[PDB]
Motif scaffolding. Structure first.
Motif, PDB file in Angstrom:
ATOM      1  N   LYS A  55     -11.846  35.327  10.862  1.00 49.67           N
ATOM      2  CA  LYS A  55     -12.433  34.125  11.519  1.00 49.67           C
ATOM      3  C   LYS A  55     -11.987  34.233  12.615  1.00 49.67           C
ATOM      4  CE  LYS A  55     -12.597  29.682  10.254  1.00 49.67           C
ATOM      5  NZ  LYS A  55     -11.647  28.864   9.067  1.00 49.67           N
ATOM      6  N   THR A 108     -12.548  32.635  16.333  1.00 47.51           N
ATOM      7  CA  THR A 108     -13.052  31.423  17.153  1.00 47.51           C
ATOM      8  C   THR A 108     -12.590  31.530  18.487  1.00 47.51           C
ATOM      9  OG1 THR A 108     -11.055  30.256  17.305  1.00 47.51           O
ATOM     10  CG2 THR A 108     -12.119  29.878  15.610  1.00 47.51           C
ATOM     11  N   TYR A 162     -17.185  27.508  14.297  1.00 51.29           N
ATOM     12  CA  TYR A 162     -15.767  28.061  14.865  1.00 51.29           C
ATOM     13  C   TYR A 162     -17.466  29.391  14.448  1.00 51.29           C
ATOM     14  CZ  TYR A 162     -14.815  26.975  10.013  1.00 51.29           C
ATOM     15  OH  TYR A 162     -15.822  26.402   8.959  1.00 51.29           O
ATOM     16  N   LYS A 163     -16.624  30.472  15.117  1.00 49.46           N
ATOM     17  CA  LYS A 163     -17.349  31.746  14.525  1.00 49.46           C
ATOM     18  C   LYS A 163     -16.208  32.503  14.009  1.00 49.46           C
ATOM     19  CE  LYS A 163     -20.288  32.016  15.329  1.00 49.46           C
ATOM     20  NZ  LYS A 163     -21.258  32.195  13.819  1.00 49.46           N
ATOM     21  N   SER A 205     -13.085  27.021  19.422  1.00 53.79           N
ATOM     22  CA  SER A 205     -12.358  26.413  18.399  1.00 53.79           C
ATOM     23  C   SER A 205     -12.146  25.638  17.922  1.00 53.79           C
ATOM     24  CB  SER A 205     -11.050  26.852  17.862  1.00 53.79           C
ATOM     25  OG  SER A 205     -11.031  26.650  16.555  1.00 53.79           O
ATOM     26  N   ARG A 246      -7.984  33.217  16.919  1.00 49.74           N
ATOM     27  CA  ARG A 246      -9.294  32.485  18.479  1.00 49.74           C
ATOM     28  C   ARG A 246      -8.668  33.340  19.555  1.00 49.74           C
ATOM     29  NH1 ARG A 246      -5.340  27.455  18.216  1.00 49.74           N
ATOM     30  NH2 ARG A 246      -5.141  26.980  20.358  1.00 49.74           N
TER      31      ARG A 246
END
Length: 88
Positions: A12, A14, A23-24, A17, A80
């Motif tokens: 994950k 982000t 989110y990515k 975020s 992130r």
């Protein structure tokens, strides 16, 4: 019928975020260049890694000399990206 697997994980990353947009989160194996993959996708997420830094939800340093697995285990999955400093 090309097949080849053994170990996989969901990473994950982000870029913002933020509450507004989602989110990515992508999926990648453990045997891969974390930094590369990160800077790669992140670069297209308006979040570079050359001048910017990467940290987890809490905000901790990471070793780019490790693989997705090592980075996925130490931290977990929720990470992130954001700039650490600015000049111009």
């Amino acid at each position: 019928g090309p097949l080849g697997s053994m170990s996989k994980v969901s990473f994950k990353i982000t870029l913002t975020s933020d509450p507004r947009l989602p989110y990515k989160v992508l999926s990648v194996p453990e045997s891969t260049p974390f930094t590369a993959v990160l800077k790669f996708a992140a670069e297209e997420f308006k979040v570079p890694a050359a001048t910017s830094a990467i940290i987890t939800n809490d905000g901790i340093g990471i070793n780019p000399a490790q693989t997705a697995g090592n980075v996925f285990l130490k931290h977990g999955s929720e990470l992130r990206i954001i700039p650490r400093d600015r000049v111009g």
